[PDB]
Symmetry: D2
Subunit: 98 residues, 4 copies
């Protein structure tokens, strides 16, 4: 069972993301087996550096919305108040293929 | 250059999705090389059938927002008025790995 | 200083909303002076009854994102795990008028 | 019948908003009777000037999703490719009051 987890940083908070980035990745590390796809959303331009990060997107396995809820609630990014938006959706790969 | 393309169906419009589903997939077919990840969002429960579809999510390569804009504008789903929400974000895979 | 606070219920959770609706309104009651606009989003059709509710939208005064964060975190609806999406934006009335 | 219409500008496109702002307001002018609430979302800080605008939010009367769809499709802002996100929801004022 897969979930899309989309979270967008509040304006002006890039430094909060940076300050908590190592802790965020350490929080994801034990969960890596459950994360199918993951990475930051990016802002203006073509840059792909740390300074270009504007949010977090993951596709993750979970047994329940309760599990997803706790995962989100316990993220260092969430606890730091980084995000202005959070969107979660149950999801599956298209079964033809795209 | 990758973009997240998230689109959520209007309420009560599952039959519109069904009616246009073959055309939508035919529209995606020539673009398949550019689509890294793709599939429907799903609603209540654990079902993964056609009746459980509530929207469309894709991660796709494009050279420009203009290209993404046209791709969205020309989708049979868009032309049928299926969606209540559309969210597009530039994005990259996390470069450690998750 | 005004914020849009948009929150959409998880699929299949209308009964959670109902179960917590009185508590939610009681939670908003002391804050009513700060809420400029408020009401539920509605689903398919033209109905405007309790059964048609699909989420919560408010425009509210706050002195800080920290205040908004706590307001959201302490809502009976949030504690019950009602929502799949939460979007917050600083906002102002257009100064001509619309 | 009321709809929330939420639209967020693409990154780096503040100047597109500025360039099209007069045309946007002229497009809204004949519709003003149908718009209950309207204004720009705002970004970082406490500023409320043109430079602080990051998107458009309206609450508007319409007889149909088809009407909302056309309204969005015909906006100078939409035609200019200003937006990264568009969210539309049927909505009503809470009938106690908040
Ligand atoms: O692969 C898919 C891609 C989509 O966009 C959709 O809506 C449904 C699918 O099965
Ligand atoms: O892999 C990643 C996953 C995230 O959630 C993030 O925010 C940044 C990354 O590089
Ligand atoms: O009133 C307004 C309405 C809008 O849609 C906008 O973008 C800016 C404003 O000032
Ligand atoms: O006024 C209201 C405010 C809310 O947040 C809600 O969910 C329902 C209502 O009727």
């Amino acid at each position: 069972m897969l979930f899309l987890i989309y979270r967008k940083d509040r304006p002006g908070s890039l430094q909060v993301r940076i300050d908590n980035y190592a802790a965020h990745l350490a929080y994801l590390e034990p969960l890596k087996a459950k994360i199918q796809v993951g990475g930051p959303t990016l802002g203006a331009g073509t840059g792909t550096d740390d300074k270009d990060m504007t949010g977090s997107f993951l596709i993750m396995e979970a047994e329940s919305w309760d599990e997803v809820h706790s995962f989100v609630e316990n993220d260092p990014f969430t606890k730091a108040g980084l995000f202005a938006a959070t969107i979660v959706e149950r999801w599956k790969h298209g079964k033809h293929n795209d």
